[PDB]
Design a protein around this ligand. Structure first.
Ligand SMILES: CC(=O)N[C@H]1[C@H](O[C@@H]2[C@H](O[C@]3(C(=O)O)C[C@H](O)[C@@H](NC(C)=O)[C@H]([C@H](O)[C@H](O)CO)O3)[C@@H](O)[C@H](O[C@H]3[C@H](O)[C@@H](O)[C@H](O)O[C@@H]3CO)O[C@@H]2CO)O[C@H](CO)[C@H](O)[C@@H]1O[C@@H]1O[C@H](CO)[C@H](O)[C@H](O)[C@H]1O
Ligand SMILES: CC(=O)N[C@H]1[C@H](O[C@@H]2[C@H](O[C@]3(C(=O)O)C[C@H](O)[C@@H](NC(C)=O)[C@H]([C@H](O)[C@H](O)CO)O3)[C@@H](O)[C@H](O[C@H]3[C@H](O)[C@@H](O)[C@H](O)O[C@@H]3CO)O[C@@H]2CO)O[C@H](CO)[C@H](O)[C@@H]1O[C@@H]1O[C@H](CO)[C@H](O)[C@H](O)[C@H]1O
Ligand SMILES: CC(=O)N[C@H]1[C@H](O[C@@H]2[C@H](O[C@]3(C(=O)O)C[C@H](O)[C@@H](NC(C)=O)[C@H]([C@H](O)[C@H](O)CO)O3)[C@@H](O)[C@H](O[C@H]3[C@H](O)[C@@H](O)[C@H](O)O[C@@H]3CO)O[C@@H]2CO)O[C@H](CO)[C@H](O)[C@@H]1O[C@@H]1O[C@H](CO)[C@H](O)[C@H](O)[C@H]1O
Ligand SMILES: CC(=O)N[C@H]1[C@H](O[C@@H]2[C@H](O[C@]3(C(=O)O)C[C@H](O)[C@@H](NC(C)=O)[C@H]([C@H](O)[C@H](O)CO)O3)[C@@H](O)[C@H](O[C@H]3[C@H](O)[C@@H](O)[C@H](O)O[C@@H]3CO)O[C@@H]2CO)O[C@H](CO)[C@H](O)[C@@H]1O[C@@H]1O[C@H](CO)[C@H](O)[C@H](O)[C@H]1O
Ligand SMILES: CC(=O)N[C@H]1[C@H](O[C@@H]2[C@H](O[C@]3(C(=O)O)C[C@H](O)[C@@H](NC(C)=O)[C@H]([C@H](O)[C@H](O)CO)O3)[C@@H](O)[C@H](O[C@H]3[C@H](O)[C@@H](O)[C@H](O)O[C@@H]3CO)O[C@@H]2CO)O[C@H](CO)[C@H](O)[C@@H]1O[C@@H]1O[C@H](CO)[C@H](O)[C@H](O)[C@H]1O
Ligand SMILES: [Zn+2]
Lengths: 249, 105, 105, 105, 105, 105
């Protein structure tokens, strides 16, 4: 694996208006209760490709990806977390509203998925970023998993890698869990406006990417660990996740 | 006999006391000014300690340990780790650090 | 005679001033060129400081502390830790660092 | 015969033993007190080790290695890395560290 | 007029030039082989620099700064931080480092 | 001439070889035991290297570089960084490290 640039390993947590990181244990409880409609997400794109998917099942896998942070979840039938489907066709695959009251909400846009998903498929497959083998169905599976795990990151108090210092509805982004000394995959919380996560992960792995490769990076996990205890964004225990390695020098 | 822990060690010296802190360093002060080549640390409750300027009270065998201790305290400050205990001489102001314990128990 | 903090220390020397920065180091410059073996740091507002080339103005007891301060400044730069205060001699250009305070408070 | 690993190395000395630990250091104690300039580490099961005060039992060639080992143990403590094995002299209390092995995935 | 920055410093020497990189070190090479005790670094664009083997061209006052610069370069390499500028002598191959600037600006 | 890279350097010595590893250190062993003051590293494929005990085969100019290399290897082990190449003397067992290359290219 190549060396991921520091900017792609940088993780930003959601702080309030007083520079204090939101505590997601305090927000969701020790166990995060969440709801999903009757699953059955269906995608229809043309170039044609159809695909049906259990929202419940894909959310389940995504949450499990984040389990190393020490979080625990609980699917509950419809102040709790909501996963929903929308059809704005907004050139936006997914979106999340982080609510300190516990009612954080994540949406997956079918209209956007139907329109714009395949727009980088052939571009990537030629770059060697995804296998020439990969089917159009698997690619839509891949993008959906990435999208859900990425939005889960937002649910767990993370923002985008490049949003340190930027202002948000409930406060400001502050870097958490910094670790530049340990090589690792790019964060799944890369700003999608500025990065192609699949492309960057492929650059890191020096080979095409599969579903088993994607997921929260080491720093992503450490970031949520910080969000699970909150406190000052200025605390060194919050700001750094491997500074002890400095002693080895 | 050789001490097994900071309390045994601290009891081998006069004018010393064990401070149980379990707190991170709040302020770190480092001076290179002549005759004040020293480090001072304080905790959130106001407790203040120094590593003394090297002097005639120090054995030759203590010269490198003085520097090691200053290294350890700076690293503790930067990482924000909790200090478990300090053994300090009370006949200096600020109290002067003789030994440190870090514990994750 | 018994300084407790950087204000006390700075008041024990002539020609010094305190700068309250509460900012990370913006630029770190290190030179090994002969007769200019020094470190210069600057902050986002342009405030600039040096650790002086070792010279006749330094006691033997200050030689290792000069090196320690350069170590501390480099570590602060790399980690982005905020510098709370610097006590500096004003009769050098850039102002010459005598002491540093780091505070998380 | 230059050893290839810690077991072979440990077997080149009398009164030594290998401890297979595979655990993090639980407590780190560092002293600059005169005649007790030493580091003591312990593990959660109570097993305790020292880096000895430099003394007549040490070759000149061992003086810097003693300091290196204390650096390594401090780094191990701060990072929480597992210690794989220690080779220790059993004719001292705490047992005295001769060599350390760190091993990963 | 005392130097305030790396450009001022570099202008105080013959045969030097400022190289602006704003890149992390791509390759770090360290040798302990006799008469080649040196460090070589290179960037992704192929630009290559050395810290020279200590020799008769160095003042006694440069001996510790040579070691400090090698420490700084190693730390920069491991942390992947951007190097802003190097001041280097052009009459050595690879170009020989006189000073370094790190900037987060 | 001055080498531009580790291969050039390695070609300036007899009984040396370049090993291309692109692997992290699997095991790190450090000894302070008298006459065996050394570091040994191994990789997951069993490949083993030493930094030799300082001896008559070393120039005075190599004494600090031996210690630097041991520092670098310890940092490499702790961070799990991949080692790109080693230049090693093959007339020692384990092969003895002359130079190291770390590369993110
Ligand atoms: C209390 C004191 O004066 N300490 C100074 C020390 O004096 C020596 C003896 O003190 C002890 C001690 O520090 O408590 C006694 C301990 O049992 C010893 N412990 C061990 C494990 O060895 C320590 C230890 O040897 C030294 O600290 C290491 O250098 O020493 C003290 O009792 C003894 O007093 C004599 C006295 O001098 C004389 O007038 C009278 O006739 O007899 C008394 C009883 O025999 O003197 C000992 C030295 O000859 O000496 C050291 C330097 O040698 C320091 O001066 C030490 O002062 C402290 O130094 C600390 C830093 O090292 C720190 O700065 C403290 O603030 C100082 O007070
Ligand atoms: C002010 C000055 O010139 N400082 C130089 C110093 O001179 C000594 C006395 O100055 C103080 C001081 O630096 O302020 C006075 C303080 O109360 C002392 N504080 C403490 C805690 O001890 C300090 C301290 O002792 C020294 O800095 C440690 O080395 O010293 C100064 O007042 C005194 O002046 C004499 C004068 O020389 C003489 O012509 C006249 O007849 O009497 C005057 C009053 O007694 O001289 C003292 C030394 O003999 O000396 C040191 C060298 O020991 C330095 O030269 C210092 O210059 C500063 O050095 C800094 C780095 O250490 C930095 O580079 C500054 O830029 C230098 O000006
Ligand atoms: C066992 C012992 O007493 N160790 C002390 C050592 O004594 C030397 C010989 O011991 C060995 C050893 O340590 O086991 C024998 C090994 O084969 C040697 N290994 C290698 C790779 O060289 C080591 C090694 O050379 C030294 O440790 C390096 O300094 O030495 C010991 O067998 C020999 O005993 C003599 C005895 O002295 C004599 O009166 C009797 O008539 O014959 C015996 C057999 O020939 O003496 C050797 C020294 O002349 O010496 C060192 C200092 O050189 C230390 O004192 C060592 O004590 C240990 O030191 C450790 C730290 O280095 C630690 O503190 C332990 O707690 C000490 O026991
Ligand atoms: C250019 C050169 O040969 N540099 C060598 C230097 O020579 C001294 C004078 O050069 C400067 C310089 O390096 O540019 C001139 C600067 O103004 C000085 N700057 C400052 C801030 O002091 C520096 C500085 O003093 C030294 O670098 C510190 O050691 O020196 C040079 O002009 C002068 O030349 C004499 C000449 O020797 C004589 O035959 C002729 O008739 O008159 C000339 C003008 O007076 O000689 C000075 C030394 O006597 O000397 C140092 C050793 O002190 C080095 O040899 C230096 O070579 C560079 O060293 C670098 C590492 O330090 C690096 O390896 C470069 O690759 C070397 O070329
Ligand atoms: C091959 C060898 O024995 N190396 C030992 C070295 O011997 C010197 C000459 O060897 C080289 C070398 O190491 O390959 C030749 C290179 O071109 C030199 N390269 C550069 C860039 O200078 C190096 C270098 O100078 C030294 O390594 C730095 O100290 O030296 C060797 O060819 C020469 O042989 C003589 C021979 O001794 C004599 O009997 C015969 O009649 O003539 C031959 C041709 O002149 O001897 C040179 C020394 O006078 O010497 C150093 C100590 O200075 C070491 O002993 C070195 O052994 C290696 O040391 C390594 C650690 O530095 C490591 O432990 C290796 O395992 C040792 O073999
Ligand atoms: Zn996002």
């Amino acid at each position: 694996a190549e060396r991921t640039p520091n900017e792609e390993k940088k993780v930003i947590g959601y702080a309030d208006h007083n520079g204090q990181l939101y505590n997601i244990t305090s927000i969701y409880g020790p166990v995060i209760n969440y709801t999903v409609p009757d699953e059955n997400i269906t995608i229809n794109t043309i170039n044609r490709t159809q695909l049906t998917i259990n929202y419940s099942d894909y959310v389940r896998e995504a949450f499990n990806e984040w389990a190393p942070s020490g979080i625990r979840v609980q699917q509950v039938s419809s102040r709790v977390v909501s996963f929903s489907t929308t059809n704005y066709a907004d050139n936006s695959l997914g979106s999340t509203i982080f609510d300190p009251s516990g009612n954080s909400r994540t949406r997956i846009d079918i209209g956007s998925f139907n329109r714009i998903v395949m727009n980088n498929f052939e571009k990537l497959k030629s770059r060697g970023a995804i296998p020439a083998n990969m089917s159009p169905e698997e690619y839509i599976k891949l993008k959906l998993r990435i999208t859900i795990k990425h939005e889960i990151g937002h649910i767990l108090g993370l923002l985008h890698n490049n949003e340190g210092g930027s202002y948000f509805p409930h406060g400001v982004g502050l870097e958490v869990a910094r670790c530049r000394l340990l090589n690792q995959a790019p964060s799944i919380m890369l700003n999608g406006s500025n990065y192609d996560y699949i492309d960057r992960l492929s650059h890191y792995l020096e080979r095409p990417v599969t579903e088993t490769d994607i997921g929260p990076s080491r720093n992503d996990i450490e970031g949520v660990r910080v969000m699970r205890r909150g406190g000052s964004g200025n605390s060194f225990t919050n700001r750094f996740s491997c500074l002890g390695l400095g002693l080895a020098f | 006999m050789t001490p097994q822990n900071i309390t045994d060690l601290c009891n081998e010296y006069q004018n010393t006391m064990i401070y149980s802190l379990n707190k991170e360093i709040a302020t770190y002060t480092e001076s290179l000014a002549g005759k004040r080549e020293m480090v001072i640390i304080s905790f959130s409750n106001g407790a203040t300690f120094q590593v003394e300027v090297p002097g005639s009270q120090h054995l030759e065998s203590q010269k490198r340990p003085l520097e090691r201790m200053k290294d350890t305290l700076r690293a503790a400050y930067f990482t924000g780790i909790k200090i478990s205990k300090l053994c300090a001489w009370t006949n200096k102001s600020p109290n002067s650090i003789a030994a440190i314990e870090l514990s994750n128990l």
